[PDB]
Swiss-Prot record, chain A:
Component of the gamma-tubulin ring complex (gTuRC) which mediates microtubule nucleation. The gTuRC regulates the minus-end nucleation of alpha-beta tubulin heterodimers that grow into microtubule protafilaments, a critical step in centrosome duplication and spindle formation. This is Gamma-tubulin complex component 5. It comes from the Eukaryota. Component of the gamma-tubulin ring complex (gTuRC) consisting of TUBGCP2, TUBGCP3, TUBGCP4, TUBGCP5 and TUBGCP6 and gamma-tubulin TUBG1 or TUBG2. TUBGCP2, TUBGCP3, TUBGCP4, TUBGCP5 and TUBGCP6 assemble in a 5:5:2:1:1 stoichiometry; each is associated with a gamma-tubulin, thereby arranging 14 gamma-tubulins in a helical manner. Gamma-tubulin at the first position is blocked by TUBGCP3 at the last position, allowing 13 protafilaments to grow into a microtubule. The gene is TUBGCP5. Belongs to the TUBGCP family. It is found in: Cytoplasm, Cytoskeleton, Microtubule organizing center, Centrosome. The chain holds residues 648 to 701 of 1024 of the full protein. Widely expressed, with highest levels in heart and skeletal muscle and moderate levels in brain.
Curated annotation (Swiss-Prot), chain B:
Belongs to the TUBGCP family. It is found in: Cytoplasm, Cytoskeleton, Microtubule organizing center, Centrosome. It is linked to Microcephaly and chorioretinopathy, autosomal recessive, 3: A disorder characterized by congenital microcephaly and chorioretinal dysplasia associated with poor vision and nystagmus. Variable ocular anomalies include microphthalmia, retinal folding, retinal detachment, optic nerve hypoplasia, absence of retinal vessels, round areas of chorioretinal atrophy, and attenuated electroretinogram. Most patients have mild developmental delay and mild learning difficulties. Ubiquitously expressed. This is Gamma-tubulin complex component 4. The chain holds residues 287 to 382 of 667 of the full protein. Component of the gamma-tubulin ring complex (gTuRC) consisting of TUBGCP2, TUBGCP3, TUBGCP4, TUBGCP5 and TUBGCP6 and gamma-tubulin TUBG1 or TUBG2. TUBGCP2, TUBGCP3, TUBGCP4, TUBGCP5 and TUBGCP6 assemble in a 5:5:2:1:1 stoichiometry; each is associated with a gamma-tubulin, thereby arranging 14 gamma-tubulins in a helical manner. Gamma-tubulin at the first position is blocked by TUBGCP3 at the last position, allowing 13 protafilaments to grow into a microtubule. Component of the gamma-tubulin ring complex (gTuRC) which mediates microtubule nucleation. The gTuRC regulates the minus-end nucleation of alpha-beta tubulin heterodimers that grow into microtubule protafilaments, a critical step in centrosome duplication and spindle formation.
Length: 50, 96
C-alpha cells in the first residue's frame, strides 16, 4: 500500500453547472420571480411548513 | 387568477392545455407573418375553454342557481307573502 501510494497511486492520479440559459425556452421560461416562486418558493414554503 | 387567489389552488381552466396554448403561441412566434386570424382563433379557443370551465365553476362551484333563487325570493319578492307580512307589520313605522 505504501509503495502503491508513493509510485502507482502517484502515477494513476489522472483524477483531473446550472444551465440558466433562457435561450432554449425563453417563451416557456417563467419570469424570474415566477421561476423563483415555482422552483424555490414552493420548496421553501414546504420546508417552512414542515 | 384573482379567484384562485381567494379560491383554493384550483388549477387553470386550461390545466395542462395551458402549455399547449403556450406552444401555439410559440408557433405564432415562429410564424413569419403576423396573422390576426390565427391569433384570434387561438384566443377564441382559449377563451372557449376558459368560459366552459368558468361556467362549470359558476353553476356547480359558485351555485349561480341558488343565488338566482335567493334573488327571486328577495330582490324579486319571490316570498311575496313574507314581504306582505313585513309590510303589514312595518306599515306604521314606514308611514312616518
Amino acid at each position: 500500500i505504501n509503495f502503491a501510494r508513493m509510485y502507482l497511486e502517484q502515477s494513476d492520479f489522472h483524477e483531473k453547472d446550472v444551465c440558466v440559459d433562457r435561450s432554449s425556452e425563453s417563451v416557456t421560461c417563467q419570469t424570474f420571480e415566477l421561476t423563483l416562486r415555482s422552483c424555490l418558493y414552493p420548496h421553501i414554503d414546504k420546508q417552512y411548513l414542515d | 387568477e384573482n379567484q384562485n387567489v381567494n379560491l383554493t389552488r384550483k388549477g387553470s381552466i386550461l390545466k395542462n392545455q395551458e402549455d399547449t396554448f403556450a406552444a401555439e403561441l410559440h408557433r405564432l412566434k415562429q410564424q413569419p407573418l403576423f396573422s390576426l386570424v390565427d391569433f384570434e382563433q387561438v384566443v377564441d379557443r382559449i377563451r372557449s375553454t376558459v368560459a366552459e370551465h368558468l361556467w362549470k365553476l359558476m353553476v356547480e362551484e359558485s351555485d349561480l342557481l341558488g343565488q338566482l333563487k335567493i334573488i327571486k325570493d328577495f330582490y324579486l319578492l319571490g316570498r311575496g307573502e313574507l314581504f306582505q307580512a313585513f309590510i303589514d307589520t312595518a306599515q306604521h313605522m314606514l308611514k312616518t
